[PDB]
Every structure is written in structure tokens, then in C-alpha cells.
Design an enzyme around this catalytic site. Structure first.
Site, PDB file in Angstrom:
ATOM      1  N   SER A  88      39.718  35.771  39.492  1.00 28.87           N
ATOM      2  CA  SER A  88      38.321  34.247  38.361  1.00 28.87           C
ATOM      3  C   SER A  88      39.767  33.720  38.508  1.00 28.87           C
ATOM      4  O   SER A  88      38.600  32.046  37.906  1.00 28.87           O
ATOM      5  CB  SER A  88      37.329  34.642  37.915  1.00 28.87           C
ATOM      6  OG  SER A  88      36.077  35.247  38.453  1.00 28.87           O
TER       7      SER A  88
ATOM      8  N   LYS B 146      39.436  29.987  40.215  1.00 26.44           N
ATOM      9  CA  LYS B 146      38.737  28.618  40.259  1.00 26.44           C
ATOM     10  C   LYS B 146      38.861  27.701  39.781  1.00 26.44           C
ATOM     11  O   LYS B 146      39.102  26.256  40.295  1.00 26.44           O
ATOM     12  CB  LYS B 146      37.772  29.581  39.063  1.00 26.44           C
ATOM     13  CG  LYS B 146      36.327  30.508  39.896  1.00 26.44           C
ATOM     14  CD  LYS B 146      35.312  30.585  39.162  1.00 26.44           C
ATOM     15  CE  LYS B 146      34.169  31.635  39.983  1.00 26.44           C
ATOM     16  NZ  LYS B 146      34.864  32.968  39.725  1.00 26.44           N
TER      17      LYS B 146
ATOM     18  N   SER C 151      31.402  31.536  35.646  1.00 32.58           N
ATOM     19  CA  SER C 151      32.891  32.154  36.394  1.00 32.58           C
ATOM     20  C   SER C 151      31.531  32.281  37.628  1.00 32.58           C
ATOM     21  O   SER C 151      31.584  33.796  38.615  1.00 32.58           O
ATOM     22  CB  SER C 151      33.258  33.072  36.730  1.00 32.58           C
ATOM     23  OG  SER C 151      34.653  32.887  35.992  1.00 32.58           O
TER      24      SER C 151
ATOM     25  N   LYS D 179      40.591  29.784  31.387  1.00 33.49           N
ATOM     26  CA  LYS D 179      38.959  29.838  32.013  1.00 33.49           C
ATOM     27  C   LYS D 179      39.443  31.832  32.233  1.00 33.49           C
ATOM     28  O   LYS D 179      40.867  32.003  31.871  1.00 33.49           O
ATOM     29  CB  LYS D 179      39.848  29.866  32.886  1.00 33.49           C
ATOM     30  CG  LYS D 179      38.930  30.153  34.502  1.00 33.49           C
ATOM     31  CD  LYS D 179      37.525  29.878  34.494  1.00 33.49           C
ATOM     32  CE  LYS D 179      36.968  30.106  35.286  1.00 33.49           C
ATOM     33  NZ  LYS D 179      36.764  31.574  35.200  1.00 33.49           N
TER      34      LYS D 179
HETATM   35  C1  LIG Z   1      36.427  36.793  37.757  1.00 32.92           C
HETATM   36  O1  LIG Z   1      37.227  37.023  37.820  1.00 32.92           O
HETATM   37  C2  LIG Z   1      35.392  36.991  38.683  1.00 32.92           C
HETATM   38  N1  LIG Z   1      35.187  38.738  38.706  1.00 32.92           N
HETATM   39  C3  LIG Z   1      34.419  39.347  39.278  1.00 32.92           C
HETATM   40  O2  LIG Z   1      33.470  39.030  39.709  1.00 32.92           O
HETATM   41  C4  LIG Z   1      34.085  41.124  38.796  1.00 32.92           C
HETATM   42  C5  LIG Z   1      34.894  41.021  40.660  1.00 32.92           C
HETATM   43  C6  LIG Z   1      35.813  42.007  40.849  1.00 32.92           C
HETATM   44  C7  LIG Z   1      35.661  42.269  42.266  1.00 32.92           C
HETATM   45  C8  LIG Z   1      34.824  42.962  42.449  1.00 32.92           C
HETATM   46  S1  LIG Z   1      33.761  42.309  41.158  1.00 32.92           S
HETATM   47  C9  LIG Z   1      34.206  36.554  37.661  1.00 32.92           C
HETATM   48  N2  LIG Z   1      35.293  36.629  36.226  1.00 32.92           N
HETATM   49  C10 LIG Z   1      34.894  37.383  34.700  1.00 32.92           C
HETATM   50  C11 LIG Z   1      35.510  36.965  34.253  1.00 32.92           C
HETATM   51  O3  LIG Z   1      35.967  37.526  32.742  1.00 32.92           O
HETATM   52  O4  LIG Z   1      36.610  36.312  34.281  1.00 32.92           O
HETATM   53  C12 LIG Z   1      33.837  38.192  34.841  1.00 32.92           C
HETATM   54  C13 LIG Z   1      32.715  39.089  35.799  1.00 32.92           C
HETATM   55  S2  LIG Z   1      32.661  37.084  37.040  1.00 32.92           S
END
Ligand SMILES: *C(=O)[C@@H](NC(=O)Cc1cccs1)[C@@H]1N=C(C(=O)O)CCS1
Ligand SMILES: [Mg+2]
Ligand SMILES: [Mg+2]
Length: 466
Positions: A49, A52, A298, A410
């Protein structure tokens, strides 16, 4: 000071939680421009994430912090006598905040414009974006959950956090032995249901399971929930977000005195009515605003919608390929050396993505000077902040330390991946830092991160609360 901070970070990185993991850690002072710390800054790693950041630093370049997304309803020609119209298209253009009520305010307008009967079919048009729902390398096992909701131009957003392409399923206990009650939220009447869940004895093991088997639009429930158990809810994605926005709006009209004789389906305006009558319209908030509920929690679906939105701007194509090309260059025109970058999506969900701690830091600096630097820094999660819309993914981290209310970073979490990049504003220096971890085999190394962050919070001249 500097000669000191180094040994501290090095020691924190010697945590057994990081055995076998590769860590990209880079710290720089945004003021002086001095490199305070660097370990494997050039190593390409999955950002998860943290991708982003690149996506937000580009949407603000391409669409402008004042950008707004609009939705509209239309018939070939307006009504009249018995106020009757034929076919009606719900046409949306990438609004990531379409509420259920927003649709109800339009259901009313349609009635407030004289329509009283939709003798034709109710089509849902989302051609502003391509029909490519998921990125090619995302996994299908992740498709039932909110994190991986299909992408569409016309999609309904749930709650105050705007979880798109999803529905809230609820499971309420009954009496031991009787079937449980399952409510499908918005997708009621839309998505199929296969209720195999029973109510277990009071005090029994909750073994509930809410699924959407791959390839179907059926919400399946199995196992049992105890009689004495509290009602359970859970977000679940639906096949074709648009068809649901279509179903809800159909219900919405019916709630506004407009009868719909035809069927509700997927369709685009004939391109035969170059001047169709626009019965109603909706405009969302500005990106500057939607930014907040995007970078704090996120929102994955938000990220991809922004990307494609960038693809419609820069080239008239709601597509990832066009979107990503836009991001890459927008990050270049922003002055970011994008060599180590490899953009496969906007959310960070794709394992095809790659960044280097240096590229991340680089991005942090440049974004700090952009005319939108404030609406950007403010969208970021604040450490140890109890309020969900302020702390975000950092609302339960670093509470009671120098990093509280200070660190704007982030996050990024994925199996085997974790990251923390952001700013540490201290009278001792404005800081930008990036920590990317790939390869660890246990839980996300939060303590390792928090430790470095909280140490930077101090290096910047902050103190832990007493
Ligand atoms: C970013 O990393 C995003 N993560 C997910 O959606 C988890 C998955 C990876 C593959 C399939 S699901 C969002 N960011 C988070 C963070 O701590 O930054 C937590 C969950 S959602
Ligand atoms: Mg319904
Ligand atoms: Mg402080």
C-alpha cells in the site's frame, strides 16, 4: 546526534523478527537535504500500500485538488403527458463516494422532473472506465473481500469510509437448532444467497463463514453462530458493482413514486441520442477532500479508480495502462527519478509493483513542495491518534511516545511485506523517511518500524508524554 542516531537504527534493525527479510530504510532531512540514514536504499522491493503515495502524488498533479466526479440519469427524451419515459441509463463517471442516499436524491429528482413511469428497461452505464474489473496479477482468492472489490466507473460506496463495490452482510442468532438470519445489506434482491448457517448452543464456538465463491454473485454462509452471540456484520464485494448500483437505484425510484416496468441491466447510452435529456445529476466532494478517507484507511478501490481517472484525463481512456503511464510521467514532471519504479497498479495490491526506499523518499520531498503539499500531508495517517479519521492505520501505534500526533506516515501490509514512509516534522528538522520490509516470515515488523519512527520523532526534537 547524527553520529549517534545511526547506531540506534542499526541496532533496531538487528531484530530477530527481520531474519531473512530485506529492509529498505532511508531517512533524509527535507530542510538541509542531508541524508541521515540509508540501508539498501536502491534495492527494488514490493511497496504494498505504500504505492498509494505515488498514486496520490499523481492524481493531484493530473486531476487537480479541486477535481470532482459526477453521476447522471438520462432518457432519450424527457416525459410529458402521463410523464412516461422508456429506457433509462444510470451513468456515472468514477465517483468514489456514491452514497446510497446520493442515489435516492437522484431517484427523487427523476420524479421531481415529471417522470412517473419507466416503461423501458433500467440500464446502468459505466463506460467512462473499461470493464476490466481486477488487475491481472491480483489473486482470485482475495476477490470476496472489500480489499479486492471489482473496479467500475459506476459503483456504490459503503459507509463514511466509502468502501466501494461491496455490501454489508449481517448474521443474527436465533434459537439453538434453528437457522440463522442472514441479511445481505444492499445486495439484497441482487446477489443470490445460500444460507447454510445454523444457531449453535449458547456459549458455543463461533465458526461462521461468509463467502462469495469465485466466479459467482452468490453470498454463501456456512457454520454456526452461538445463540448468545452478538449480531455479526461483514463487508463483501459483489460481481459487477454497476449492476448493484443499478439495482439500488431501481429500488430508489420505486421509493420516489417512479414505476419501472422493464428490467435492470448493464448497458451504455445508445450513442444514438447525441442530446439525451439529463433528468438528474450528482456531484461529489473535491479530491482534496476525498483524499482524507483514501490515505487514512488505504482504500484500494479508490486507488485504482484514481489511476483510471488519470487515464481518462491524460488520454481519454479509463484504463490502468493509460492510467499508470500517466502516473509514471506525472511523477517525472514532479521531478521524481522513476528508474527503480515498476507500476502495476495504484493500490499496491499487486506483487508486480516495485519501489526503492530512495524513490519513496524522493517522492516525499518533491510532494512537500507541490502547491498541494498541505492537502497531501494532511491526508496521511497521524501516529497515536485515537480518532479514525486522523490516526488512520496508525491510530493504535506509537501512542504515548514522541511520535504521537507527530509522525505523518503511510503504511503498507501484505503477506511477507510491510512498509512505513512519511514525514517527522520537528523543530530539529523536517524529516522524510521510508522503511520497506520484504521477506520476513512472521508478523509485520511494526515494533521495528515504530521503534525507528519514535526514535526519529525524538531526533527531530520531540518528547514522549508523561
Ligand atoms: C496496502 O498494503 C493494502 N493492503 C491489503 O489490501 C492487504 C492485501 C494484500 C493482498 C491481498 S489483501 C491496505 N493497507 C493496509 C496498511 O496497513 O497499509 C492494511 C490493509 S488494506
Ligand atoms: Mg435490494
Ligand atoms: Mg510532540
Amino acid at each position: 546526534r547524527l553520529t549517534e542516531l545511526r547506531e540506534d537504527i542499526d541496532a533496531i534493525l538487528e531484530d530477530p523478527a527481520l531474519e531473512g527479510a530485506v529492509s529498505g530504510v532511508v531517512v533524509v532531512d527535507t530542510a538541509t537535504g542531508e541524508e541521515l540514514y540509508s540501508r539498501d536504499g536502491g534495492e527494488q522491493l514490493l511497496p504494498a500500500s505504500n504505492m498509494k503515495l505515488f498514486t496520490a502524488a499523481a492524481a493531484l498533479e493530473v486531476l487537480g485538488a479541486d477535481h470532482s466526479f459526477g453521476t447522471e440519469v438520462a432518457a432519450e427524451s424527457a416525459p410529458g403527458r402521463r410523464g412516461e419515459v422508456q429506457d433509462l441509463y444510470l451513468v456515472g463517471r468514477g465517483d468514489p463516494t456514491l452514497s446510497a442516499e446520493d442515489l435516492d436524491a437522484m431517484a427523487a429528482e427523476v420524479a421531481a422532473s415529471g417522470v412517473r413511469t419507466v416503461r423501458g428497461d433500467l440500464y446502468a452505464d459505466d463506460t467512462w472506465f473499461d470493464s476490466e474489473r481486477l488487475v491481472d496479477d491480483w489473486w482470485p482468492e482475495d476477490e470476496p473481500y472489500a480489499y479486492s472489490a471489482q473496479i467500475s466507473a459506476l459503483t456504490v460506496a459503503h459507509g463514511e469510509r466509502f468502501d466501494t463495490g461491496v455490501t454489508e452482510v449481517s448474521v443474527t442468532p436465533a434459537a439453538e437448532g434453528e437457522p440463522a438470519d442472514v441479511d445481505l445489506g444492499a445486495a439484497e434482491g441482487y446477489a443470490e444467497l445460500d444460507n447454510r448457517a445454523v444457531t449453535g448452543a449458547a456459549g458455543s464456538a463461533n465458526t461462521l463463514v461468509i463467502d462469495r465463491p469465485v466466479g459467482t454473485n452468490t453470498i454463501a454462509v456456512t457454520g454456526s453462530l452461538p445463540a448468545d452471540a452478538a449480531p455479526v456484520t461483514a463487508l463483501r464485494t459483489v460481481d459487477e458493482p454497476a449492476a448493484l448500483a443499478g439495482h439500488l437505484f431501481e429500488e430508489a425510484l420505486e421509493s420516489n413514486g417512479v414505476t419501472v416496468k422493464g428490467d435492470v441491466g448493464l448497458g451504455g447510452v445508445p450513442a444514438d441520442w447525441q442530446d439525451a435529456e439529463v433528468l438528474a445529476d450528482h456531484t461529489s466532494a473535491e479530491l482534496s477532500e476525498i483524499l482524507v478517507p483514501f490515505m487514512k484507511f488505504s482504500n484500494n478501490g479508490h486507488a485504482e479508480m484514481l489511476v483510471k481517472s488519470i487515464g481518462q484525463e491524460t488520454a481519454g481512456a479509463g484504463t490502468w495502462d493509460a492510467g499508470l503511464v500517466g502516473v509514471e510521467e506525472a511523477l517525472s514532471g514532479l521531478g521524481v527519478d522513476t528508474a527503480g519504479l515498476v507500476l502495476n497498479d495504484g493500490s499496491g495490491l499487486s506483487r508486480g509493483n516495485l519501489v526503492t526506499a530512495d524513490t519513496v523518499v524522493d517522492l516525499l520531498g518533491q510532494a512537500g513542495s507541490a502547491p498541494w503539499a498541505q492537502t497531501w500531508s494532511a491526508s496521511l495517517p497521524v501516529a497515536g491518534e485515537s480518532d479514525p479519521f486522523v490516526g488512520g492505520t496508525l491510530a493504535n501505534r506509537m501512542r504515548g511516545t514522541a511520535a504521537e500526533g507527530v509522525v505523518e506516515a503511510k503504511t503498507g501490509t501484505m503477506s511477507g511485506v510491510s512498509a512505513l514512509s512519511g514525514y517527522v516534522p520537528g523543530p530539529e528538522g523536517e524529516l522524510a523517511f521510508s522503511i520497506v520490509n520484504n521477506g520476513h516470515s512472521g508478523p509485520a515488523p511494526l515494533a521495528v518500524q515504530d521503534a525507528i519512527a519514535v526514535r526519529l520523532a525524538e531526533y527531530a526534537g520531540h518528547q514522549a508524554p508523561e
